[PDB]
C-alpha cells in the first residue's frame, strides 16, 4: 500500500527546444578539393549509414512556419558567404567612367547592346602612371551617365568585392546534425502539409542532404513529394503569403551560356588582379533555358488540380508572369556553374484553366554584379567563367503568389515570385522538428533502499 | 528498439530499455564555432544530471530506489494504472507540479542516511 520515490535515468520524454545544429558533409574533399563557399573541409564527416528509428504509438504536432531549424540555416548561409568574400579583392578602383561601345553595332540583330566593350583608365603597377585597359561588360551592369560614358551599376550605392576565383559555387549536400542529448523528429507522412498532427513520426540524428541552392520562382534540385503535388502556404487566404508547390516528378530544365568566353587579368593594384572578360571566340549567341513543352504542360495541370482543393472545385485558375520588383524576383534567377542567370519565365506562366519533341526556350541573361538579398549596401562581382556553360537540373517546385480581387471575382491569378531565401530552406526542412531529451524521472514503485 | 523507440509505450514497458537512452546522451570558422559550442553544451548538460543523480545517492545506476515515500497527494493513482496505462510523457506532465518538491526531498533524505551511516560506523 505504501510507495517510495524511485528515480529512473534514460526515460523517453522530450521537449521542443531550439539549439545550435552543426554539420555533417558526406562529400568531404574526395581527393578533388576546390574549396567552395560552404561545408567541404570544415563540416564534420557524416555517417556511412544513418540511423532512423520509427517512434511507434506517437503522434507529434508540426508547424512548418514556426520552425527554428530554418531561421538558423538562413543565417548560417549569409555568414558562409560573408566569410568567403572578406579575403579577396575589393573593386573600389573600378569607379572610373567607362567609354563603352556596343560589341556588335552594325554586326547582327537590331543593334542591341547586350554586350558593351568598355575601356577605362587604371593604375597598373605604379600609382602615378595609369594605362588604358578595357573589358567586356554586360548591359545589365553599366549605367549611362549624362560612345557615351558609362559606369558600374553598383558603385553609387554598394561596395563591390570580387569573388575569389578559386572557390567553387557548386552546392554540396549538407546534413544538419544535432548535439548529444537532442534529437530531430522526422514526419514520415507522405501527404504532409507542414502543420497539424503527424501520426507517423521518426527519430533521426540529422537531416538528409540539403543542397544550399538559392533560386527564385522555381525550386531547382530540391526534394520531390512522394505521392502528389503539395501546396503549402502560411495563410492560404492571404494574398501577401507565398505558396510553395512541390512536384512529385521533376521537370528537367537545360540551359547554357553558348558563348566561349575568355577571362583576362587586369592589375588594379600591387598584388591584386581584376578578372575581366577579354573577348568571345566564335559567334555571339544568347543564353537560354529549355523546358519540355509536354512535361511542363502535364505537371502544371497537376498543380491546378490541387489548387482547386483550396480555391473551390469549380473555379478558373490562370497563371500570369511576375508583376514587378528586382530582376531576381521578376525573373527565374539561379547560379549555373558560377554564372548567374535571370531567365524570362513568361512562356511558362501563360495559361488559363477551366473546370472541364517540342520545347520551351526561356531567354536568360547574365549578370556580373550581384547584390545581397534581404538588403545591405553590398555587392559581389562574379569573375567570368572561361568556357561554355552547360548545366541541367530538376524543377521540384514553385513559389507562387496570389493577387487581390478574389472577393467578387470567380477567377484566380497566380503570379510567380521569389526574393526571400528563407522560403528556400523551408521547402526542404519543413518536416523536421528538433526536440531535447529529458532523461530523469520519478515514480512510486514500492522499492525501498536498504539501510 | 532504438533511441526513443519506447516513447509511446506505457511506463512499465519503457523501463526495460533504459540503457538505450542512457548511453546516447553523451556520445574556428562559422562551422567550427557552432561545432565547438555543440560539444561544450553537451558535456555541461550531461554533467548537470550526473551531479543531481549523485546528491541523491544513485550515482552509477539507471534505477535507484529511495527512502522517501510518495505522499499520495502528488498522485493518488494505483500502482497498475501508473505503470501500465500512462506513458512517461503523460506521467511527467501530470507530476510536473511536484518535481521541485520531490527533488528537494531526495537530497535532504540522502544527507540524513549519510550522517546516520556515519554515526553508525563509529559503533
Amino acid at each position, epitope marked *: 500500500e505504501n510507495l517510495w520515490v524511485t528515480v529512473y535515468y534514460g526515460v523517453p520524454v522530450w*521537449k*521542443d527546444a531550439e539549439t545550435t545544429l552543426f554539420c555533417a558533409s558526406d562529400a568531404k574533399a574526395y581527393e578533388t578539393e576546390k574549396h567552395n563557399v560552404w561545408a567541404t573541409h570544415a563540416c564534420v564527416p557524416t555517417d556511412p549509414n544513418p540511423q532512423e528509428i520509427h517512434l511507434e504509438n506517437v*503522434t507529434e*504536432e508540426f*508547424n512548418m512556419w514556426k520552425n527554428n531549424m530554418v531561421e538558423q540555416m538562413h543565417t548560417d548561409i549569409i555568414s558562409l558567404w560573408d566569410q568567403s568574400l572578406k579575403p579577396c579583392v575589393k573593386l573600389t578602383p573600378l569607379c572610373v567612367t567607362l567609354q563603352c561601345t556596343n560589341v556588335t553595332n552594325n554586326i547582327t540583330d537590331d543593334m542591341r547592346g547586350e554586350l558593351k566593350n568598355c575601356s577605362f583608365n587604371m593604375t597598373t603597377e605604379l600609382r602615378d602612371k595609369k594605362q588604358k585597359v578595357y573589358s567586356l561588360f554586360y548591359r545589365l551592369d553599366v549605367v549611362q551617365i549624362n560612345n557615351k560614358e558609362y559606369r558600374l551599376i553598383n558603385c553609387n550605392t554598394s561596395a563591390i568585392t570580387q569573388a575569389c576565383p578559386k572557390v567553387s559555387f557548386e552546392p554540396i549536400p549538407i546534413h544538419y546534425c544535432a548535439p548529444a542529448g537532442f534529437a530531430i523528429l522526422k514526419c514520415k507522412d507522405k501527404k504532409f502539409n507542414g*502543420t*497539424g*498532427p503527424c501520426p507517423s513520426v521518426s527519430t533521426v540524428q540529422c537531416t538528409h542532404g540539403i543542397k544550399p541552392v538559392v533560386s527564385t520562382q522555381l525550386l531547382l534540385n530540391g526534394s520531390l513529394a512522394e505521392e502528389e503535388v503539395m501546396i503549402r502556404s*502560411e*495563410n*492560404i*487566404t492571404n494574398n501577401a503569403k507565398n505558396i510553395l508547390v512541390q512536384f512529385n516528378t521533376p521537370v528537367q530544365i537545360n540551359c547554357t551560356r553558348p558563348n566561349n568566353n575568355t577571362r583576362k587579368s587586369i592589375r588594379i593594384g600591387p598584388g591584386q588582379a581584376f578578372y575581366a572578360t577579354g573577348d568571345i571566340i566564335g559567334d555571339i549567341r544568347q543564353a537560354h533555358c529549355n523546358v519540355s513543352k509536354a512535361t511542363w504542360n502535364e505537371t502544371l495541370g497537376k498543380v491546378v488540380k490541387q489548387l482547386r482543393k*483550396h*480555391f*473551390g472545385n469549380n473555379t478558373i485558375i490562370r497563371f500570369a508572369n511576375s508583376s514587378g520588383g528586382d530582376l531576381e524576383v521578376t525573373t527565374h534567377s539561379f547560379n549555373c556553374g558560377g554564372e548567374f542567370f535571370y531567365c524570362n519565365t513568361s512562356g511558362l506562366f501563360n495559361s488559363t484553366w477551366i473546370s472541364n519533341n517540342d520545347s520551351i526556350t526561356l531567354p536568360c541573361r547574365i549578370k556580373q554584379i550581384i547584390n545581397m538579398w534581404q538588403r545591405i549596401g553590398q555587392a559581389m562581382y562574379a569573375p567570368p567563367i572561361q568556357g561554355v556553360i552547360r548545366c541541367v537540373s530538376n524543377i521540384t517546385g514553385l513559389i507562387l503568389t496570389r493577387d487581390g480581387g*478574389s*472577393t467578387n471575382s470567380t477567377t484566380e491569378t497566380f503570379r510567380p515570385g521569389g526574393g526571400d531565401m528563407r522560403d528556400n530552406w523551408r521547402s526542404e526542412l519543413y518536416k523536421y522538428k528538433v526536440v531535447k531529451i529529458e532523461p530523469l524521472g520519478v515514480a512510486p514503485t514500492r522499492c525501498k533502499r536498504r539501510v | 528498439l532504438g533511441f526513443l523507440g519506447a516513447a509511446g509505450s506505457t511506463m512499465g514497458a519503457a523501463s526495460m530499455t533504459l540503457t538505450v537512452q542512457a548511453r546516447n546522451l553523451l556520445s574556428l570558422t562559422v562551422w567550427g564555432i557552432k561545432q565547438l559550442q555543440a560539444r561544450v553544451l553537451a558535456v555541461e548538460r550531461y554533467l548537470r544530471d550526473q551531479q543531481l543523480l549523485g546528491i541523491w545517492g544513485c550515482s552509477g545506476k539507471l534505477i535507484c530506489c529511495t527512502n522517501v515515500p510518495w505522499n499520495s*497527494s*502528488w*498522485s*493518488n493513482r494505483n500502482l497498475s494504472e501508473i505503470w501500465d496505462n500512462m506513458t512517461w*510523457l*503523460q506521467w511527467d*506532465k*501530470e507530476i*510536473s*507540479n511536484y518535481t521541485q518538491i520531490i527533488y528537494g526531498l531526495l537530497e535532504e533524505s540522502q544527507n540524513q542516511q549519510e550522517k546516520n551511516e556515519q554515526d553508525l560506523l563509529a559503533l
Partner: antibody
Amino acid sequence: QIHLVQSGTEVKKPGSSVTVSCKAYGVNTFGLYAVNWVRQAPGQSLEYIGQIWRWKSSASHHFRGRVLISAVDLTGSSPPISSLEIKNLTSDDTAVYFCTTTSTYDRWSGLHHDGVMAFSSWGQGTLISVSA
Amino acid sequence: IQMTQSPSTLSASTGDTVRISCRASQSITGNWVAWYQQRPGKAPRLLIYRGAALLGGVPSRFRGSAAGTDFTLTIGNLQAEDFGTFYCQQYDTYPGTFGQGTKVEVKR
C-alpha cells in the same frame, strides 16, 4: 487576433433540426486547435456538448447519437469554420450555444490534459429558442 | 467529478480582496482546474488554468490556489470590472465539468 463569430438568434419548432456555425478568424488550422462546443442554459451553468480535436469528433454521453460536430480547414476565402447540428430539438434545448477553441500545439501546456481542455477562446453566443 | 462552488452570492465592495472557493468531489492532484469570469450579457472568460496559472492578459490581481480537493480564487484589490459570475471547471477526467456560479455584487 482569434475572433470566433457564430450565427444569429433563431426560433425553431420543437422537433426540427438546427445548425449553428462558428467562423474562426485568426485560427491558422484545425489540426493545431481544438474546437469544443459548450451550451449555457437560460439560468444554469455551462454544459459541454462535444468537440473536434484531431479531425475526430465526439459528443458527451447526453448528446451521443443526437448531435453532429463538423469542421473544415483554411480554404481560400473563408477561415476554418465549425458547425454544430442538433437533431430532434426538445423544450430544454433552448440555450446560448458557445463555440470555443484551445491551442493544442504545445505539448506541455496545461490548457489541455490529454484529451480534455480548458477553453481559452470563446465565441459570442448563438441563443437558440425552441418554442411552439 | 462535480465541482461545488461557495458562496453562490458574494456581494463585496470595491477596493477589497475577495475569495471564491471550489471543492471537487475527489482529489485533483494534477491541478486540472481553470476559472472563468462571465459578465452580464457576454461570453465566459478564462482567468486561471492549471490551478493557479494566470492566462496571458489577465490582470495580476487574480490569484488562484490548488489544494488537491479545495481550489480557490482570490480577487485582490477589487475593481468595478470584476463583478460577475465566476465558474469552476475541471479537466482532470472526461468530460470537463463546471461549477454553478458565484455572483459578486456591490455593498453600498
